[PDB]
């Protein structure tokens, strides 16, 4: 599922800027 | 047509009143922009409480008011090539005035650090609430979105591009309204600009593709934010940024099945790769967004006046309560780089 893909991305935590 | 006479006259009059408000707000902004405030307090006026450079909860010794104190070591700003951004962020913060922008109450510097003391927003980041709750209902998402729309309408009228919209940068105050923080990538550019900056999930395609770009990147970012608030995850993600960027530029976006048709229509017009079709970038400006069906129930003036009952009030265990913020380390606080920071 899309939600599962999101968890698998490893980018669920706070995201840094470039 | 869509609107009868009465609604048409009401809408036109509202759009004219916006113009009149923005005109006065630009006058007020430019006066402070052209003569910024400096050295309005000092460190020993404050007890340091807890880490939230660095941002610390502090208590003003004489008023007991709490503040978030951003502490920046000058020599460390220099080595990281950030003098102009730091100067500019402070300059912007002391010149703007809007109900959804965090308020710089004091600033000062000393031999080692620069200090920005703003109103403490005790509710924490939207990011935490969104991950915890999972996703926001469309009315809940819309209440926040309306505040960003108004805030961008304000900033863009001052020729300010914000460039780092994301839930991490949106604080929730004690009444449940948003306070935008972190103007470190904002810039006062009338035309185009070219800097590669922002957060991967939120970058407009024209940034990724190394084009000159304009304030339309903020409207793209609003589309990403609305989607993330209502889905619980962003419209473009992947393991690594380069794969996210391929998705962003692809011109394709998929929506959860619980998204309303109105919301999908709005997002297809914000998340529009074609700058000639992207809402916020057309002849009708921000009005294409404000008048969209998804915002049909939004009373824009009531949002601005903060008269709308918020859908969510973070737990408020007291002033100086830090529980909506997470826990961090423990550093202490020690002339360096004097010329570089004269204007601060
Ligand atoms: O200005 C900030 O970045 C900031 C960061 C972390 C917590 C904050 C609480 N109140 C205001 C501002 C804050």
For residue B221, what are its two tokens? 């970012």
Question: According to the entry, how was the structure determined?
Answer: X-ray
Backbone angles phi, psi at B189, to 5 degrees: -130, 120
- Which residues 6+ apart lie within 8 Å of B162 measured at CB? B152, B155, B180, B183, B185, B186, B218, B221
The span from the CA of B252 to the CA of B244, in Å, is 12
Alpha-carbon torsion angle B72, B75, B79, B82, nearest 10: 40
Backbone angles phi, psi at B96, to 5 degrees: -80, 160
> Nearest-CA neighbor of B244 among B203, B206, B198?
B203
Q: Which secondary-structure segment (H or E) carries B144?
A: helix B138-157
For residue B235, CA distances in Å to A12, B100, B218, B267 come to 13, 25, 16, 10
Task: Give me the numbers of helices (H) and strands (E) for chain A, helices first please.
Answer: 1, 0
For residue B251, what are its two tokens? 């011109």
Q: Is the sign of the CA dihedral B190, B214, B295, B298 positive or negative? A: negative
To one decimal place, what's the resolution in Å?
1.9
Distance in Å, alpha carbon of B224 to nearest chain A alpha carbon: 14
Q: Which secondary-structure segment (H or E) carries B142?
A: helix B138-157
Domain that holds residue B177: 125-307
CB atoms inside a 10 Å sphere around CB B68 = 21
Does B326 participate in catalysis according to the annotation? no
For residue B319, what are its two tokens? 């002033």
Q: How many CB pairs under 8 A join A and B?
A: 37
Cβ proximity of B200 and A15 under 8 Å: yes
- CATH assignment of the domain containing B177: 1.10.510.10
Cβ proximity of B81 and B93 under 8 Å: no
Cβ proximity of B18 and B284 under 8 Å: no
- Which residues 6+ apart lie within 8 Å of B318 measured at CB? none
Whether B328 has its CB under 8 Å from any CB of chain A: the answer is: no
Whether B237 has its CB under 8 Å from any CB of chain A: the answer is: yes
Long-range contacts of B133-137 (CB under 8 A, 24+ apart): B134/B232, B135/B229, B135/B230, B135/B231, B135/B232, B136/B229, B136/B230, B136/B311, B137/B230, B137/B311
The span from the CA of B12 to the CA of B6, in Å, is 10
Q: Which secondary-structure segment (H or E) carries B323?
A: none
Return the residue matching tokens 């991305």.
Answer: A9
For residue B326, CA distances in Å to A14, B29, B51, B302, B329 come to 12, 34, 9, 32, 10
The span from the CA of A7 to the CA of A15, in Å, is 14
Q: Indicate which of A4, A9, A10, A12 best probes the interface with B, i.e. most B CBs within 10 Å of its own CB.
A: A9
Backbone angles phi, psi at B56, to 5 degrees: -125, 140
């Amino acid at each position: 599922t899309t939600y599962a893909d999101f968890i698998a991305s490893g980018r669920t935590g706070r995201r840094n800027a470039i | 047509g869509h609107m009868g006479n009465a609604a048409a006259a009401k809408k036109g009059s509202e759009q004219e009143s916006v113009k009149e408000f923005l005109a006065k707000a630009k006058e007020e902004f430019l006066k402070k922009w052209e003569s910024p405030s400096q050295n309005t307090a000092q460190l020993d006026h404050f007890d340091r409480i807890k880490t939230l450079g660095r941002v610390m909860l502090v208590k003003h010794k004489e008023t007991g008011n709490h503040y978030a104190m951003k502490i920046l070591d000058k020599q460390k700003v220099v080595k990281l090539k950030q003098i102009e951004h730091t100067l500019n962020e402070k300059r912007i913060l002391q010149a703007v005035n809007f109900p959804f922008l965090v308020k710089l109450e004091f600033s000062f510097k000393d031999n080692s650090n620069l200090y920005m003391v703003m109103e403490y927003v005790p509710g924490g980041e939207m990011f935490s609430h969104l991950r915890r709750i999972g996703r926001f209902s469309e009315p809940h998402a819309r209440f926040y979105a309306a505040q960003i729309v108004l805030t961008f309408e304000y900033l863009h009228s001052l020729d300010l591009i914000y460039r780092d919209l994301k839930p991490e940068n949106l604080l929730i105050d004690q009444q449940g309204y948003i306070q935008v923080t972190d103007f470190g990538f904002a810039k006062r550019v009338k035309g185009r600009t070219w800097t590669l900056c922002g957060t991967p999930e939120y970058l407009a395609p024209e940034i990724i593709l190394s084009k000159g770009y304009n304030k339309a990147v903020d409207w793209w970012a609003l589309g990403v934010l609305i989607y993330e608030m209502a889905a619980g995850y962003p419209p473009f993600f992947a393991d690594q940024p380069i794969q996210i960027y391929e998705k962003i530029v692809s011109g394709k976006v998929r929506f959860p099945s619980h998204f309303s048709s109105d919301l999908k229509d709005l997002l297809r017009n914000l998340l529009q790769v074609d700058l000639t079709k992207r809402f916020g970038n057309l002849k009708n400006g921000v009005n294409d967004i404000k008048n969209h069906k998804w915002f049909a129930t939004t009373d824009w003036i009531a949002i601005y006046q903060r008269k709308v009952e918020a859908p969510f009030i973070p737990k408020f265990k007291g002033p100086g309560d830090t529980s909506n913020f997470d826990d961090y380390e423990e550093e202490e606080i020690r002339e360096k780089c004097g010329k570089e920071f004269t204007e601060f």
